[PDB]
DNA sequence: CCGTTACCGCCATCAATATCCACCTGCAGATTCTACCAAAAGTGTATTTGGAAACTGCTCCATCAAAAGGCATGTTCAGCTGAATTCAGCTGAACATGCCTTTTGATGGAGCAGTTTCCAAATACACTTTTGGTAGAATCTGCAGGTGGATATTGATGGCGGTAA
DNA sequence: TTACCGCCATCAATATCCACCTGCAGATTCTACCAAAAGTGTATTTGGAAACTGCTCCATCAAAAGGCATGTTCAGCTGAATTCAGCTGAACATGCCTTTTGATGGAGCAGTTTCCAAATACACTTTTGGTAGAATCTGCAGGTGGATATTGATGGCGGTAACGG
């Protein structure tokens, strides 16, 4: 009977506070450490990592990802939008240059 | 064998090459001790490569159906949820897009092992009432079926117990010059058609005989001035339109009877008795059809059925037209224009009723019931039905689209139509066949007038009443008095209209049946 | 008698940021007030983010300061945040802002 | 078990001078010993090209002073400045 | 179903092991309130540039100190001479 | 009267400007610009020749860089012509201003 | 010396959109230049200053290209064919 | 009577290489291979943009290198760009670069 | 006056190694001399920094050789080890 | 004709939810105290030296003159580009459903580090020789700049074609 | 039967390419010089190769659990279609002031000599920060109880309007 449901950014604009206020990290540790090692194989064979050194890309990996994640979404906003596509990424890594 | 062995390698080797899909199917399902319970055929990967290299394969059929009853095992065993299962979907998706162009170098039109999906049961015991998949019935001669339920609730040791997960494998037609086993639906070869035999594309193509005429199309069917000027409003909007994939759309009424729809003992015994309203009310009911060639093929896309009571009928039915049912299917070219070209057909007949003098215009916006089907049997799943909502905002579309155009004066709910026209009785209401009010007055029969009221202000937004304001001869036709006719002669011989090629042989059977006829 | 640093009035190391100077081969020669005022730059550094910290800290009812404090503190303060700005502070996260045009009405 | 060389108990001391009754967690204490060690790089460093450019084989005052004010930004370049010539000065009389 | 359920199971190439909720928690974070559909898996690519950029260079640190284990300190110098400085893992 | 539509003789600038590569902004007024802006930071400042067409080409690499980035912004944003938020937006990506 | 002032305007328009046409630029909008300007500007107070702050070390009065290559250099915007 | 350089078989000077780096405050010893390591990487990275820098030149219908040519050679090598993505070069200008869009729209 | 040294006659000789009939203007020439000064100072710099991370006083050919690996992109990384190997091993061989 | 009911818009407010906060309480983590000692750190003495001052040679930095032509400055017209408005296909947001993959804890040995030996390899430095800067004069030479004309490029001028009333 | 927008065709106005030819600042060729490096040849020192080995901690594997992956429905995000005010591009007339070539006074950059306060290299004595183990303290992460804006939705009311008897 009508149930209860919440309209489409009410909730998104709740994860935005949530997410924004707290500081733990969002990728989960399993995948990431085998990425790494996926990406470690990929150049030398038979490497050892430490608990730090992954916990250190995955911090950095994350900070990048949000910057990135607000340069895309200023970009967004320029376009008069507010969902970001990928060709709001590829201006935003243009415009840093990485490219 | 090795021609065959050649052939179908590459496909295995597809399948193969999914990573990890094909991992779970490479080698035989070693028990999961209820695993021989439920497949009783266990089969995987390695064994067809065993069986094609053997050569035991006398042709491809066998090959592709033992790979769709692994993917039927596969798909049984699992549950839906699990990963095994997106496996098997993964496997079986890409086999459906590398089996064709194998088989058509091997002189097939297709390899996918077509099986008739499981039809509507309509159960013999209380109306309405369906039978839902892995839901089990009782069945005699497959035709009569009953529900658990009902059959509990009714010589009985007779009816066979089964469960509503038949699938019914596709026939096959022999080509008389190569000998090569078609699907029948795939290559639409009848035997009314084309009592010479069957004779495949590519036999025709090496020999350079054309393909003969259909004798029994659309085109061909008995034309009507309704019908014409439907068919002619279509092809005009399409040809403004200018999109190249808008085939060619005919327009058919193949039906047109005079019928009498009774009054029910309960309004009869308050209204009829004091002789203040009558006691029957005669009407023409008429069913048309919209055909599109597609790719040379008819297809039946869309008709309706309609009840006309004229200017003769007594009050409050005199000089009106009420829609009963309607059907679409979304397999019509091009799709964006679909929903515009159903919008021009229903203009256009309403153009042609406001033409022939008639006054309003009834539609009720309650779409089918899950499982059940208005006019074309076996709707395609891809087809979202949509919501009573949704029929509604598309009808305020019309009606929009309609007013803009000046043909209509104007539309409301009857809940509005009730309170302007300042109704006092029941008696006033439009009575048609079939129609929800007739119910919904005996039923509070079994004081009318605030419980219409009530009623009305309750479901005002499902019913369409339109201000406006016959040289159509006769046609009896059996098969299309009605829906029942043809919604059974369908489930009786398999007309379903789940696919494109379904669809196309569905409307050639039902087009030569009409000619037959 | 008295350490460089007690008798420079700083709390840091002038031995040790002298030591790191010389193995750094930053230079053949070190001056002597050198490392003196490179301390006295790290510890006036070093007091500015402790100190922006514990008010951040004190604004979250905290008496303890955690890297979310530090990345409060450099991040708020424009001229902290400019020296920083190629420098990501683990488990620090981000300030709260949302976009005026995601702002529902 | 090599002894590692940090500027804990140091910043703690400072952190004493600001906050006497403010704490710092182990992950925090070593974000700030990492600032502390990038900043003193990236002076030292700025440092050394300053002597370079100028043909100067030895790092004095000026070059930390001359480092600081093209790396800090306003303020805290002034106040950087000054409490080295605080320092220097004490340093001198003492 | 039977087999196994554990280190047979392989599946989730290392760039796909990244979830989607993953993607979306990041963005959140950047403050992006909608996602288009084809995001993801760029980001994911994007991400997955990003590794080579760090990692190699780290491992080419593992590499000179003639080590078998990549350090928490290579991972620093590494994010340091890409201008992406890390603090926090100098211990 | 012959006359071009608009656009034409502005790509004919494009093409001869990114063929050419002569100074753009003249020596005088660019020079007057650095003097004023040195003698802001530093009364009785002194310039060399050499400093000051350094100073030139770098300002004009970093302008063209940056006008660039502004013609991919407005591109993006399904125009052809710059506008100052363009450039700000160019400006915040790279970092110079947030 | 003569204190010069309002010498931004010497950042001429035809300039500007001379600079725009080396970078792209088909169409420019009337609130570009004055911003443009201003940008300018500002990256002159953001590398002749450190310049400056290279000629005060050395005890020089007067800037030399090298110390303009110096700045550069540690602003990020290193620089070819005057020294260094 | 035989030179570092032309004992390792190389154009440019170890030595001077090596009183660079012993100069430049970098540690407190240098290897003996390590200047004409550097060297050797110097000598072909020169080659390189030099190769680049005749193509172009030649491409222009140019016997003498400009700087032009040399931004040209920069900017059209992937690797090269990369290594000199943060360097300006003097009296180079830019790569002949129009979008599609800034083409006619006819 | 003081001298001032460049690359200029090394250039040279590697541009008529290269083109024997192709030139170079004084412009380009002071583009090249910065050009390689300044991979000079790079790869310099990433080598004290890997020598001092791993403890080490002594830049050797593989502290050199690290470094270019970590500046230089793919080919051009390639090529220039191909080559330090190369020059390195000629060297030794006297 | 003005009157009831549908629609647009406002908004005042029962009700489910996530969360700020009022309070708590156990524990991982931060804080306090005693002891040890190699590791730095501070002080003393002789030595070495980088750069301060003192004077001056000298390069180029600043400044004033005059011409005039390359562009700067201002104005006008309209081409068409940026901006505002509608709306309909539809892609994602919110959510219930199901399960499974991730996280946490415990346990062998692959190598990270500590000790010792000793040698190929790195500095320290005094000559001797080769060689890269480079003042100066002379010849060579690629291309700056102007001319003329064949060659694409642009735009809408003659007219042909529905067409729409 | 008249203007109006399209299209493929020619045509006129105009920028482009380009070959050619001349004067010259810049590029390349020698002569001589020469002090700064480069290299060879002993003496001294030491970074680190090499072998043996204790101690980390990292890969591997078990269960417990806090999550992720799919299908459904739909409000609203987005992009195409339309229209139009007005912004800036193209053209042109007028004239402004930047550039070039020239010369000049001198503030100021830099070479040369002298030499001393400051940095360095030990050698010795003093403090002291890093580490290990015990035991006490506590900030806060969740967990439980209200409970609070808050926002979707249900609903009531006012203003517009729309058509009927």
Same mark, same amino acid.
């Given at each position: 009977?009508?149930?209860?449901?919440?309209?489409?950014?009410?909730?998104?604009?709740?994860?935005?506070?949530?997410?924004?206020?707290?500081?733990?990290?969002?990728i989960?540790?399993?995948?990431?450490?085998?990425?790494?090692?996926?990406?470690?194989?990929?150049?030398?064979?038979?490497?050892?990592?430490?608990?730090?050194?992954?916990?250190?890309?995955?911090?950095?990996?994350?900070?990048?990802?949000?910057?990135?994640?607000?340069?895309?979404?200023?970009?967004?906003?320029?376009?008069?939008?507010?969902?970001?596509?990928?060709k709001?990424?590829?201006?935003?890594?243009?415009?840093?240059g990485?490219? | 064998?090795?021609?065959?062995?050649?052939?179908?390698?590459?496909?295995?080797?597809?399948?193969?090459?999914?990573?990890?899909?094909?991992?779970?199917?490479?080698?035989?399902?070693?028990?999961?001790?209820?695993?021989?319970?439920?497949?009783?055929?266990?089969?995987?990967?390695?064994?067809?490569?065993?069986?094609?290299?053997?050569?035991?394969?006398?042709?491809?059929?066998?090959?592709?159906? %033992?790979?769709?009853l692994?993917?039927?095992?596969?798909?049984?065993?699992?549950?839906?949820?699990?990963?095994?299962?997106?496996?098997?979907?993964?496997?079986?998706?890409?086999?459906?897009?590398?089996?064709?162009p194998?088989?058509?170098?091997?002189?097939?039109?297709?390899?996918?092992?077509?099986?008739?999906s499981?039809?509507?049961?309509?159960?013999?015991?209380?109306?309405?009432?369906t039978?839902?998949?892995?839901?089990?019935?009782?069945?005699?001669?497959?035709?009569?079926?009953?529900?658990?339920?009902?059959?509990?609730?009714?010589?009985?040791?007779?009816?066979?117990?089964?469960?509503?997960?038949?699938?019914?494998p596709?026939?096959?037609?022999?080509?008389?010059?190569?000998?090569?086993?078609?699907?029948?639906?795939?290559?639409?070869?009848?035997?009314?058609?084309?009592?010479?035999?069957?004779?495949?594309?590519?036999?025709?193509?090496?020999?350079?005989?054309?393909?003969?005429?259909?004798?029994?199309?659309?085109?061909?069917?008995?034309?009507?001035?309704?019908?014409?000027h439907?068919?002619?409003?279509?092809?005009?909007?399409?040809?403004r339109?200018?999109?190249?994939?808008?085939?060619?759309v005919?327009?058919?009424?193949?039906?047109?009877?005079?019928?009498?729809?009774?009054?029910?003992?309960?309004?009869?015994?308050?209204?009829?008795?004091?002789?203040?309203?009558?006691?029957?009310?005669?009407?023409?009911?008429?069913?048309?059809?919209?055909?599109?060639?597609?790719?040379?093929?008819?297809?039946?896309?869309?008709?309706?059925?309609?009840?006309?009571?004229?200017?003769?009928?007594?009050?409050?039915?005199?000089?009106?037209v009420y829609?009963?049912?309607?059907?679409?299917?979304?397999?019509?070219?091009?799709?964006?224009?679909?929903?515009?070209?159903?919008?021009?057909?229903?203009?256009?007949?309403?153009?042609?009723?406001?033409?022939?003098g008639?006054?309003?215009?009834?539609?009720?916006?309650?779409?089918?019931?899950?499982? %059940?089907?208005?006019?074309?049997?076996?709707?395609?799943?891809?087809?979202?039905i949509?919501?009573?909502?949704?029929?509604?905002?598309?009808?305020?579309?019309?009606?929009?689209?309609?007013?803009?155009?000046?043909?209509?004066?104007?539309?409301?709910?009857?809940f509005?139509?009730?309170?302007?026209?300042?109704?006092?009785?029941?008696?006033?209401?439009?009575?048609?066949?079939? %129609?929800?009010?007739?119910?919904?007055?005996?039923?509070?029969?079994?004081?009318?007038?605030?419980?219409?009221?009530?009623?009305?202000?309750?479901?005002?937004?499902?019913?369409?009443?339109?201000?406006?304001?016959?040289?159509?001869?006769?046609?009896?036709?059996?098969?299309?008095?009605?829906?029942?006719?043809?919604?059974?002669?369908?489930?009786?011989?398999?007309?379903?209209?789940?696919?494109?090629?379904?669809?196309?042989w569905?409307?050639?059977?039902?087009?030569?049946?009409?000619?037959?006829? | 008698?008295?350490?460089?640093?007690?008798?420079?009035?700083?709390?840091?190391?002038?031995?040790?940021?002298?030591?790191?100077?010389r193995?750094?081969?930053?230079?053949?020669?070190?001056?002597?007030?050198?490392?003196?005022?490179?301390?006295?730059?790290?510890?006036?550094?070093?007091?500015?983010?402790?100190?922006?910290?514990?008010?951040?800290?004190?604004?979250?009812?905290?008496?303890?300061?955690?890297?979310?404090?530090?990345?409060?503190?450099?991040?708020?303060?424009?001229?902290?945040?400019?020296?920083?700005?190629?420098?990501?502070?683990?488990?620090?996260?981000v300030?709260?802002?949302?976009?005026?045009?995601?702002?529902?009405? | 078990?090599?002894?590692?060389?940090?500027?804990?108990?140091?910043?703690?001391?400072?952190?004493?001078?600001?906050?006497?009754?403010?704490?710092?967690?182990?992950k925090?204490?070593?974000?700030?010993?990492?600032?502390?060690?990038?900043?003193?790089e990236?002076?030292?460093?700025?440092?050394?090209r300053?002597?370079?450019?100028?043909?100067?084989?030895?790092?004095?005052?000026?070059?930390?002073?001359?480092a600081?004010?093209?790396?800090?930004?306003?303020?805290?370049?002034?106040?950087?400045?000054?409490?080295?010539?605080?320092?220097?000065?004490?340093?001198?009389?003492? | 179903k039977?087999?196994?359920?554990?280190?047979?199971?392989?599946?989730?190439?290392?760039?796909?092991?990244?979830?989607?909720?993953?993607?979306?928690?990041?963005?959140?974070?950047?403050?992006?309130?909608?996602?288009?559909?084809?995001?993801?898996?760029?980001?994911?690519?994007?991400?997955?540039?990003?590794?080579?950029?760090?990692?190699?260079?780290?491992?080419?640190?593992?590499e000179?100190?003639?080590?078998?284990?990549?350090?928490?300190?290579?991972?620093?110098?590494?994010?340091?001479?890409?201008?992406?400085?890390?603090?926090?893992?100098?211990?």
């Open positions: 009977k009508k149930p209860h449901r919440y309209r489409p950014g009410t909730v998104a604009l709740r994860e935005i506070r949530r997410y924004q206020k707290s500081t733990e990290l969002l989960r540790k399993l995948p990431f450490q085998r990425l790494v090692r996926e990406i470690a194989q990929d150049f030398k064979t038979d490497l050892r990592f430490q608990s730090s050194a992954v916990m250190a890309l995955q911090e950095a990996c994350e900070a990048y990802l949000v910057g990135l994640f607000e340069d895309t979404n200023l970009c967004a906003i320029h376009a008069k939008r507010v969902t970001i596509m990928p709001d990424i590829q201006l935003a890594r243009r415009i840093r990485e490219r | 064998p090795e021609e065959l062995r050649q052939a179908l390698m590459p496909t295995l080797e597809a399948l193969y090459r999914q990573d990890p899909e094909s991992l779970p199917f490479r080698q035989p399902v070693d028990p999961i001790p209820d695993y021989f319970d439920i497949v009783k055929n266990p089969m995987d990967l390695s064994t067809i490569k065993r069986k094609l290299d053997t050569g035991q394969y006398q042709e491809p059929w066998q090959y592709v159906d %033992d790979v769709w692994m993917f039927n095992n596969a798909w049984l065993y699992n549950r839906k949820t699990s990963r095994v299962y997106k496996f098997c979907s993964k496997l079986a998706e890409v086999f459906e897009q590398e089996i064709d194998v088989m058509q170098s091997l002189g097939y039109c297709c390899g996918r092992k077509y099986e008739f499981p039809q509507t049961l309509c159960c013999y015991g209380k109306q309405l009432c039978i839902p998949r892995d839901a089990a019935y009782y069945s005699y001669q497959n035709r009569y079926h009953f529900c658990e339920k009902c059959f509990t609730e009714i010589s009985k040791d007779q009816f066979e117990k089964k469960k509503n997960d038949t699938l019914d596709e026939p096959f037609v022999d080509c008389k010059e190569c000998g090569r086993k078609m699907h029948q639906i795939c290559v639409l070869h009848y035997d009314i058609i084309w009592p010479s035999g069957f004779v495949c594309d590519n036999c025709l193509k090496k020999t350079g005989r054309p393909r003969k005429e259909n004798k029994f199309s659309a085109k061909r069917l008995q034309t009507t001035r309704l019908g014409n439907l068919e002619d409003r279509v092809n005009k909007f399409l040809r339109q200018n999109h190249p994939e808008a085939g060619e005919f327009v058919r009424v193949v039906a047109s009877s005079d019928k009498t729809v009774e009054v029910k003992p309960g309004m009869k015994s308050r209204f009829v008795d004091s002789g203040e309203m009558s006691e029957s009310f005669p009407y023409r009911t008429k069913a048309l059809f919209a055909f599109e060639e597609i790719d040379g093929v008819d297809v039946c896309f869309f008709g309706m059925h309609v009840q006309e009571y004229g200017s003769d009928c007594p009050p409050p039915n005199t000089r009106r829609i009963s049912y309607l059907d679409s299917i979304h397999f019509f070219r091009p799709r964006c224009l679909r929903t515009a070209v159903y919008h021009e057909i229903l203009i256009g007949y309403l153009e042609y009723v406001k033409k022939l008639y006054v309003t215009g009834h539609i009720w916006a309650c779409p089918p019931s899950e499982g %059940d089907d208005y006019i074309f049997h076996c709707h395609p799943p891809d087809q979202k949509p919501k009573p909502k949704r029929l509604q905002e598309w009808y305020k579309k019309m009606l929009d689209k309609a007013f803009a155009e000046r043909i209509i004066h104007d539309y409301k709910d009857i509005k139509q009730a309170t302007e026209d300042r109704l006092t009785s029941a008696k006033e209401l439009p009575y048609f066949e079939g %129609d929800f009010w007739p119910n919904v007055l005996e039923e509070s029969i079994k004081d009318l007038s605030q419980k219409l009221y009530a009623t009305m202000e309750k479901h005002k937004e499902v019913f369409f009443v339109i201000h406006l304001h016959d040289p159509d001869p006769l046609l009896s036709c059996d098969l299309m008095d009605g829906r029942d006719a043809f919604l059974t002669l369908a489930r009786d011989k398999h007309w379903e209209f789940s696919s494109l090629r379904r669809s196309k569905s409307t050639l059977c039902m087009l030569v049946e009409l000619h037959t006829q | 008698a008295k350490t460089r640093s007690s008798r420079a009035g700083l709390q840091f190391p002038v031995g040790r940021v002298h030591r790191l100077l193995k750094g081969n930053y230079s053949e020669r070190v001056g002597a007030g050198a490392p003196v005022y490179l301390a006295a730059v790290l510890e006036y550094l070093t007091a500015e983010i402790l100190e922006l910290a514990g008010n951040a800290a004190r604004d979250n009812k905290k008496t303890r300061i955690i890297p979310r404090h530090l990345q409060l503190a450099i991040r708020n303060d424009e001229e902290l945040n400019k020296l920083l700005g190629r420098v990501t502070i683990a488990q620090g996260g300030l709260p802002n949302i976009q005026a045009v995601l702002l529902p009405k | 078990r090599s002894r590692k060389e940090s500027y804990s108990i140091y910043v703690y001391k400072v952190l004493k001078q600001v906050h006497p009754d403010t704490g710092i967690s182990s925090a204490m070593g974000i700030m010993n990492s600032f502390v060690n990038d900043i003193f990236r002076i030292a460093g700025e440092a050394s300053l002597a370079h450019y100028n043909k100067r084989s030895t790092i004095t005052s000026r070059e930390i002073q001359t600081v004010r093209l790396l800090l930004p306003g303020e805290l370049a002034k106040h950087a400045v000054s409490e080295g010539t605080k320092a220097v000065t004490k340093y001198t009389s003492a | 039977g087999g196994a359920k554990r280190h047979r199971k392989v599946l989730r190439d290392n760039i796909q092991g990244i979830t989607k909720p993953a993607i979306r928690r990041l963005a959140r974070r950047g403050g992006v309130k909608r996602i288009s559909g084809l995001i993801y898996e760029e980001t994911r690519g994007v991400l997955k540039v990003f590794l080579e950029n760090v990692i190699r260079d780290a491992v080419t640190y593992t000179h100190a003639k080590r078998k284990t990549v350090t928490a300190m290579d991972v620093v110098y590494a994010l340091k001479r890409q201008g992406r400085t890390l603090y926090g893992f100098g211990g």
